[PDB]
Amino acid sequence: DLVDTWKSFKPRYKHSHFIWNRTELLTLDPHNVDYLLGLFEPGDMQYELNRNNVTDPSLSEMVVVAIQILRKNPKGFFLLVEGGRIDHGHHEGKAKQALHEAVEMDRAIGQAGSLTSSEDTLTVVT
Amino acid sequence: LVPEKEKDPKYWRDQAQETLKYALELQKLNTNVAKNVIMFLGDGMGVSTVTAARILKGQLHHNPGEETRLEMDKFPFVALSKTYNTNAQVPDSAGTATAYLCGVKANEGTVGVSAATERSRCNTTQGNEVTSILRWAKDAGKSVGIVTTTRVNHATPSAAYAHSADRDWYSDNEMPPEALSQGCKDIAYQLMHNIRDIDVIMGGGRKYMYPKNKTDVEYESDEKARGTRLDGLDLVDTWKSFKPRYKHSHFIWNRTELLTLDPHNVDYLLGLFEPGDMQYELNRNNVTDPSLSEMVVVAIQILRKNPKGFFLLVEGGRIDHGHHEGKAKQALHEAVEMDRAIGQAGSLTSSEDTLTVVTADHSHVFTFGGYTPRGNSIFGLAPMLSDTDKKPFTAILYGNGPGYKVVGGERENVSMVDYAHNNYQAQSAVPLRHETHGGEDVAVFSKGPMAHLLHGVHEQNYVPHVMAYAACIGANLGHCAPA
Amino acid sequence: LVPEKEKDPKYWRDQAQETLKYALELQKLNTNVAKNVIMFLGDGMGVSTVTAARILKGQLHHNPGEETRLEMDKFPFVALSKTYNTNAQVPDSAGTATAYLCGVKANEGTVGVSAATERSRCNTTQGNEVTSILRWAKDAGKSVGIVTTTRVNHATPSAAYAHSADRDWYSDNEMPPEALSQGCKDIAYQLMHNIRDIDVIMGGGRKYMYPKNKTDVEYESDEKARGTRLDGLDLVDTWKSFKPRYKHSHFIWNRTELLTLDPHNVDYLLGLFEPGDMQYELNRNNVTDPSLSEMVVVAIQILRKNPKGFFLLVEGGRIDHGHHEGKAKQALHEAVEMDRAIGQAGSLTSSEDTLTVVTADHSHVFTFGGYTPRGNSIFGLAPMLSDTDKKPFTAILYGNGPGYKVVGGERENVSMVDYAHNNYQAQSAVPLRHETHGGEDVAVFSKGPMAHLLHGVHEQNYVPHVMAYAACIGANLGHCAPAA
Amino acid sequence: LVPEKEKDPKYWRDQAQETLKYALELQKLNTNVAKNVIMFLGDGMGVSTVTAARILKGQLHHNPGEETRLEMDKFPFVALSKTYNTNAQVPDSAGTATAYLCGVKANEGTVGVSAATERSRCNTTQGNEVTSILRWAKDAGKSVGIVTTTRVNHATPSAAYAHSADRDWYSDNEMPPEALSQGCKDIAYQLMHNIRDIDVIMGGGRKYMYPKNKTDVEYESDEKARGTRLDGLDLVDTWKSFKPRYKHSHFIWNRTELLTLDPHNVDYLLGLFEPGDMQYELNRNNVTDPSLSEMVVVAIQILRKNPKGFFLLVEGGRIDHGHHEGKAKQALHEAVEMDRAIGQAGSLTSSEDTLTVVTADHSHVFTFGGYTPRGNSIFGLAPMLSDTDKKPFTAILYGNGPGYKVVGGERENVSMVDYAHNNYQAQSAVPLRHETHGGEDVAVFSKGPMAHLLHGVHEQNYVPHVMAYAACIGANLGHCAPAA
Ligand SMILES: *[C@@H]1O[C@H](CO)[C@@H](O[C@@H]2O[C@H](CO)[C@@H](O)[C@H](O)[C@H]2NC(C)=O)[C@H](O)[C@H]1NC(C)=O
Ligand SMILES: *[C@@H]1O[C@H](CO)[C@@H](O[C@@H]2O[C@H](CO)[C@@H](O)[C@H](O)[C@H]2NC(C)=O)[C@H](O)[C@H]1NC(C)=O
Ligand SMILES: *[C@@H]1O[C@H](CO)[C@@H](O[C@@H]2O[C@H](CO)[C@@H](O)[C@H](O)[C@H]2NC(C)=O)[C@H](O)[C@H]1NC(C)=O
Ligand SMILES: *[C@@H]1O[C@H](CO)[C@@H](O[C@@H]2O[C@H](CO)[C@@H](O)[C@H](O)[C@H]2NC(C)=O)[C@H](O)[C@H]1NC(C)=O
Ligand SMILES: *[C@@H]1O[C@H](CO)[C@@H](O[C@@H]2O[C@H](CO)[C@@H](O)[C@H](O)[C@H]2NC(C)=O)[C@H](O)[C@H]1NC(C)=O
Ligand SMILES: *[C@@H]1O[C@H](CO)[C@@H](O[C@@H]2O[C@H](CO)[C@@H](O)[C@H](O)[C@H]2NC(C)=O)[C@H](O)[C@H]1NC(C)=O
Ligand SMILES: *[C@@H]1O[C@H](CO)[C@@H](O[C@@H]2O[C@H](CO)[C@@H](O)[C@H](O)[C@H]2NC(C)=O)[C@H](O)[C@H]1NC(C)=O
Ligand SMILES: *[C@@H]1O[C@H](CO)[C@@H](O)[C@H](O)[C@H]1NC(C)=O
Ligand SMILES: *[C@@H]1O[C@H](CO)[C@@H](O)[C@H](O)[C@H]1NC(C)=O
Ligand SMILES: *[C@@H]1O[C@H](CO)[C@@H](O)[C@H](O)[C@H]1NC(C)=O
Ligand SMILES: *[C@@H]1O[C@H](CO)[C@@H](O)[C@H](O)[C@H]1NC(C)=O
Ligand SMILES: *[C@@H]1O[C@H](CO)[C@@H](O)[C@H](O)[C@H]1NC(C)=O
Ligand SMILES: *[C@@H]1O[C@H](CO)[C@@H](O)[C@H](O)[C@H]1NC(C)=O
Ligand SMILES: *[C@@H]1O[C@H](CO)[C@@H](O)[C@H](O)[C@H]1NC(C)=O
Ligand SMILES: [Ca+2]
Ligand SMILES: [Ca+2]
Ligand SMILES: [Ca+2]
Ligand SMILES: [Ca+2]
Ligand SMILES: [Mg+2]
Ligand SMILES: [Mg+2]
Ligand SMILES: [Mg+2]
Ligand SMILES: [Zn+2]
Ligand SMILES: [Zn+2]
Ligand SMILES: [Zn+2]
Ligand SMILES: [Zn+2]
Ligand SMILES: [Zn+2]
Ligand SMILES: [Zn+2]
Ligand SMILES: [Zn+2]
């Protein structure tokens, strides 16, 4: 049980949670969780156009609380964000899914820009 | 002798009431968290050895000796350790090291494996390994150190990192060809491969790292110091290879390089100062070779950096070898030198966040006593001759060992020899090439967070469990659990 | 050997974590007032003696041995005691007794006096006497008891009541004329006159209580069992003559009497079962004489009456004698017999209000090694022969003593002999008529109220200062003061 | 007593070469960054006070005393401090405090200001304030603490936080209406207002914190213990209000509360244990008042939470008062208390990252002499009588102070009195109500990072410039600068 293994490796004076649906994500107090495991689908998450608004979060919703947690460390943070279903949309030849997957990551890039500062945060998009 | 102050009862009552005051203050238990964790292992340092070593330390200062306090005599909490191996009543060096380093009593001649393993048979090893508190530390992000005066592949240090079926398998030169075909790796090879980020390693075992017949740097004129690996490998080069190229790693081999260093500048240290075991403190080279205290100091200085702390294992080895030769003056002087290291380590850290543990793996058949007067030199004689053979005898006597001397049915008249010599072998009851271990319990000295948990008569494997629970490392971490 | 269950790492990991769990609950420290105090003194039972005895107690049950838990092993708190005398690096039975009973360290050969007293000089006694915890207990209304298997005027029990410049002055027959003329009195006389209402006295030494040449009540024909006193006093009668008559004072001398008595019915007990010392537990007459455990239970049942509590000094006395003789089997069985009495005391008292200490006055040069296999008989042999002279050797070996045996040249081939005998003397390095003591530290075992006050490496005389603090007796009553 | 080992030349040579061996290893200098900085200020601890207190500490363990080693004696590096003020030759507690805590020498009676400020003239305070190492430490992000046995608004502690033109302005009750109307605020007021986040504040002065005529928590019936504040402010409440509410800020006033706190949970501590100064340790109430070592231990445990480090100012301040009263036994026993506290601090910190400094502010005219024999009680007599008047004299003798006593034209035959008494005032050359300070130099004891920088004869204001440089706080940050 690698979810158990993930929990066990963490010192339990810290707050480790693990979640799987969107309600648990938007309920967390980011100021109060140190370790988070969010696995929301058995395989890949659905396309944004096919997302279920109640059981599954968007990419921006995940990126926002992800930044809010990582900021607590005084030494900074590193964050890797993958709008990685653009590729799956192009592979299927469904350009309407690929472009909507791209717009969603751009919305996320805008949210990340509001939660950090150009003066001390470097953001690379490629 | 009788000091004048000890003839006054108020002195002994004043002393006991101060001790009673400190005992009451110790009720405020230290329930902090062991950010750092140091274990001092006196090899063969039984209860009889610590008392004689205490008397020796004071006698070096022209005091009677019995009233001296060792550095470890100042640790607040003392326990007794049942040292027996799972297959040996009188235990050995390796199987005990698995007990106090891994938490599992094992078989004689094995390190890092449970009792399911059989000695020298390798197809009992896989699936039977056990991990050590050194591994538990690094897994939790701490730094780790191995400092010793024996070889780094000797039985006691090897239980920190290795999992071998025979303690004799130093390098692959010392292995049977059957065991190579089964695909088993010697201890020296295992030092550089199981935990590839041991920050500090200091001790001996230089020739088990160089290819066979390759000359040694310090003793080129000698061949018993030559390399031993049929591998043709170079584990010094190999050591340097698993560290990130941008980190500061050094490798030293003499004393000058040790003190030359900037601890604030080294991330990974490797010191191998002799081809095999390091020279007795009483025989050490001031110029070329460091002492155990010197090595402990820069070891702690390097390991102090890690914000999550460190674990350090110091083995005051060669206490064991001294008794094995029957030369008690060497074994006692090795014990006093480890006590200097306990003192230095006590100042470079704080008891508030550093749990330090001092103990032995087993004892020896070492005794002393002839109703000797107060202040009598620990290597001196009893006041009376034998009421059986009208000859003097030394306070120190061994159960067995090479001190047995008989000039044809006649036990040696000791007033004709230098019994206070460094290499003198006190008499024994049964002659052997080497004096044997002892099955009696050993003492456990502890100071720091949760040091009070080592309280009574414990099985030897219980020791690392406590040090694990205090640092919040290993298989149980409920000490850091806000209940 | 390897027992099957110990091949699993889960067995050691589980067993250890249960020991950790108990040690964590030990943090909540017993701080109640010691209503009762019990001291067990294994005379000469050093660290190496207790382990060999631990193996013996388990091998008498057909188990390997090393995994046995002695009744004293179950005690929560262990400390180490520095045993040296003011006068001696390697201490004796008497000077150490003054340390752990009177709180002051003294010269070898003396009891109940400071180091200002010089041995065998009587004019050095007055002004330098030190009192015992057995007296501090009595001055606080507690009942007091002394149970031993040596003479009741031996060195160890006599520190609780006597003050002498020589342990050797058992009766007035043994003192020099200058000592008698100088005013001081023999130890046996002191047992009846110093503190004249000791509740329980048991052990040997009967021949020192009756006038000279008085035939013993047991051995009418044994000369050496005849009385010794030149005084003429019947010290058993002097004992009877000192008690309040509205109390029941019984003198007994055999085992049938001891178990005939009704505890809740007898107030003062003096039981002297042998002329000299008591027989070893292995040589003990099952009919005429009682075991030490049988004496401890009868002693306790009499001493629980007093509402204020009691103090009881028990002495596994003949362990020291066993090592002095080279007979490891006798010394080891004496130790095991004392441990049985420890568990006997743990069932008749509660650790809630009873502080129990088990320790020793000093050690011996007794060892056992040889890399013996797991489960090997403690009296058995080492697996290998001597690589020097090809002949085997026992696990148990001594430093010095009468076990030395070179047969006109070579040392004895012990396959021809009886090394498991009760009276076998294991080989030694230096031949002596009597094996000597060890200078090493000895172990302290503590359970009960404030037992945690004995924690590390301590001077020997620190022990009664702790017992007297928990019991709220002696010089310092701060534990019963209005505080916390 | 002439100890037998000291008659052997090899003993002194073996020892000297052992001292020589250690000094050679000290050449490997400790040049790490001083994460923590601790300063022990022995108020009035002259050079003669240190040797006298050293002999005292050893004689409390039944030793001769002169060979005894104080905890401060074991400090590696020693220096001398020129203690004069700009105002005065023989300095005072306030002007020196500005020197060794703010790095600037000042006029007597003026804490926290320079020599441009004239004493009692407050129109000269603005523009002349100098900040302390405690403020530099707070500005660097470190926790800061103040532990003393005097009022927390006394001269020595007030230099760490206040800027005042007069040491006598404890509260507004003791200020002149000119200085109050001119706009200046009390040391007590500045304690809660200048640095509002001082983590640990422990000592005396409970009365200078509460409105006038409020009764004390300890001594309700004492009129002299009632509050003094004329502006009606509960400064103890002002303290709590300035801290955030999620923080654990406690305030305590007796020993039971201090030893009951869990340091891991308290964020800001304020301990005020007496209305004014605290009792001498020889007069302390073990039930209601903590010792100076007990306060130092808990303070270090709280300040240790900060990852950036901490600064602690400890003041064994009543050494100075004991000398002023002419009572050496009090002043000497005050010093031994600070030395015990120094030993506790060295147990809770490491020399690898903690620079500890022990010094005084000035000395007294206290001497001991008379060619006393080895081991002579420091409070005892000289071995001979006077050549002149044939009466004995004590080893301790003062230059001036209340000890001056002539029993009608002739000085007092001290064989009639208790010269060893706790309150005995040894005789002086000139009668005064209070013994005066001394102009001689004091010692400085340094251990930890860069401790070797305090090396020779130094102006007293040099001390805080070294401690700040080692901790990378204040003006010069060159120790943490990257290159070299
Ligand atoms: C999202 O996950 C939470 C947590 O598992 C769900 O809440 C649980 O719901 C079940 C049944 O409704 C209850 O038995 C549990 O007690 C609930 N747990 C908690 C912590 O609230 C929630 O129902 C899930 N929502 C969706 C839409 O899947
Ligand atoms: C300790 O080891 C160092 C390192 O090998 C020795 O310094 C070397 O000395 C030789 C000739 O003296 C030079 O060729 C090397 O270049 C030196 N190496 C370094 C790293 O400086 C040093 O001599 C040794 N000291 C002793 C006493 O053996
Ligand atoms: C043990 O050897 C010593 C000498 O080393 C013997 O004692 C000496 O004997 C000679 C002649 O018999 C005397 O001149 C000396 O005065 C003796 N004393 C010393 C201190 O040398 C001793 O007798 C020997 N023991 C035995 C049992 O033979
Ligand atoms: C134990 O001692 C008692 C007392 O001396 C013995 O009992 C008495 O023996 C006498 C004659 O031997 C009888 O006349 C009494 O009736 C006995 N009294 C009692 C109460 O039995 C007893 O014989 C001794 N026991 C042993 C086993 O020696
Ligand atoms: C020690 O004594 C034993 C027993 O007397 C010797 O063992 C026997 O030796 C004979 C021949 O010497 C064999 O025939 C027997 O079988 C042996 N006994 C057993 C039980 O095997 C032993 O040889 C002696 N050793 C020495 C060095 O004297
Ligand atoms: C030390 O101070 C504490 C706190 O003020 C005192 O504890 C209080 O005692 C009073 C009785 O005088 C009780 O009514 C309070 O409930 C107690 N408070 C707490 C938090 O327990 C304590 O009595 C003082 N001790 C001394 C010796 O003065
Ligand atoms: C100082 O006082 C002491 C005693 O107070 C005087 O010495 C004693 O005087 C009495 C009375 O004559 C004698 O019995 C004692 O023998 C004297 N000595 C001692 C040690 O008590 C002493 O004479 C006084 N000195 C002066 C100069 O007044
Ligand atoms: C949720 O899903 C429904 C069904 O596709 C859709 O009508 C709606 O726009 C989605 N978003 C919401 C409710 O925010
Ligand atoms: C390996 O272990 C098995 C155990 O079933 C044993 O039978 C076999 O002999 C071992 N290997 C060799 C080469 O002996
Ligand atoms: C080591 O130093 C000591 C110091 O005096 C000296 O006596 C000894 O000869 C030296 N030995 C070596 C091997 O350098
Ligand atoms: C003790 O008694 C002896 C015997 O006469 C005597 O010579 C000596 O002076 C006495 N000493 C003391 C201190 O009483
Ligand atoms: C004790 O009684 C048992 C059982 O009757 C007997 O076998 C044994 O011999 C007796 N004890 C002794 C020492 O004889
Ligand atoms: C300050 O005021 C006092 C009187 O209030 C006066 O004597 C003094 O000269 C003034 N000093 C300055 C600098 O104004
Ligand atoms: C402090 O404790 C000591 C301990 O013996 C006692 O003698 C003294 O009277 C106590 N004093 C106070 C004021 O509690
Ligand atoms: Ca989902
Ligand atoms: Ca070398
Ligand atoms: Ca009988
Ligand atoms: Ca108070
Ligand atoms: Mg080893
Ligand atoms: Mg005895
Ligand atoms: Mg002051
Ligand atoms: Zn792709
Ligand atoms: Zn070993
Ligand atoms: Zn060994
Ligand atoms: Zn004894
Ligand atoms: Zn004995
Ligand atoms: Zn001052
Ligand atoms: Zn002053």
Numbering used by the authors:
A (entry chain B): 251 to 376
B (entry chain F): 18 to 500
C (entry chain E), D (entry chain H): 18 to 501
Show sentences the authors wrote.
HPP patients exhibit hypo-mineralization and osteopenia due to the deficiency or malfunction of tissue non-specific alkaline phosphatase (TNAP), which catalyzes the hydrolysis of phosphate-containing molecules outside the cells, promoting the deposition of hydroxyapatite in the extracellular matrix. Several proteins enriched in the matrix vesicles supply sufficient phosphate for the crystallization of hydroxyapatite, and among them, the TNAP catalyzes the hydrolysis reaction using the pyrophosphate and organic phosphate esters as the substrates, such as pyrophosphate (PPi), pyridoxal phosphate (PLP) and phosphoethanolamine (PEA). The catalytic center of hTNAP is comprised of the catalytic residue S110 and three metal binding sites, one for Mg2+ and two for Zn2+ (1 and 2). The calcium-binding site includes the acidic residues E235, E291, and D306 forming strong static electric interactions with the Ca2+ ion, as well as R223, Y236, and T305 stabilizing the local conformation of the binding pocket.
Crystallization trials showed the crystals of purified hTNAP could grow in both acidic and basic pH conditions diffracting to about 5–10 Å resolution. In both structures determined with hTNAP crystals grown in acidic and basic pH conditions, four TNAP dimers, i.e., protomers A-B, C-D, E-F, and G-H, form an X-shape homo-octamer stabilized with the molecular contacts among protomers B, F, D, and H. The TNAP octamer is maintained with four major interfaces between dimeric TNAPs. Two pairs of dimers, A-B/C-D and E-F/G-H, first form two tetramers with a large interface (interface L) comprising residues from helices 1–3, 18, and 20 via a series of static electric interactions and hydrogen bonds among H79 and D25/D31, E35, and H78, K38/K45 and E311, S364-S368, and T366-T366 from the contacting protomers. The tetramers A/B/C/D and E/F/G/H then dimerize to form the octamer with two small interfaces (interface S) comprising H7, H14, and some loops. Interestingly, multiple HPP-associated mutation sites were mapped in interface L and S, including D156, K264, A492, and C497 from interface S and Y28, E311, T366, and S368 from interface L. The crystallographic analysis of hTNAP has uncovered an unexpected octameric structure that has not been observed in other previously reported AP structures. However, the disruption of the hTNAP function resulting from mutations on the octameric interface implies that hTNAP may be stabilized by octamerization, which prevents the interfaces from exposure. The conserved catalytic residue S110 was solved as the unphosphorylated form in all the protomers, which serve as a nucleophile in attacking the phosphorous. The hTNAP dimer is maintained by the static electric interactions between R71-D458, as well as the hydrogen bonds and hydrophobic interactions among residues such as T68, T85, K99, T103, Q106, H341, Y388, T389, R391, D404, N417, S445, H454, V382, L414, V447, L449, and R450.
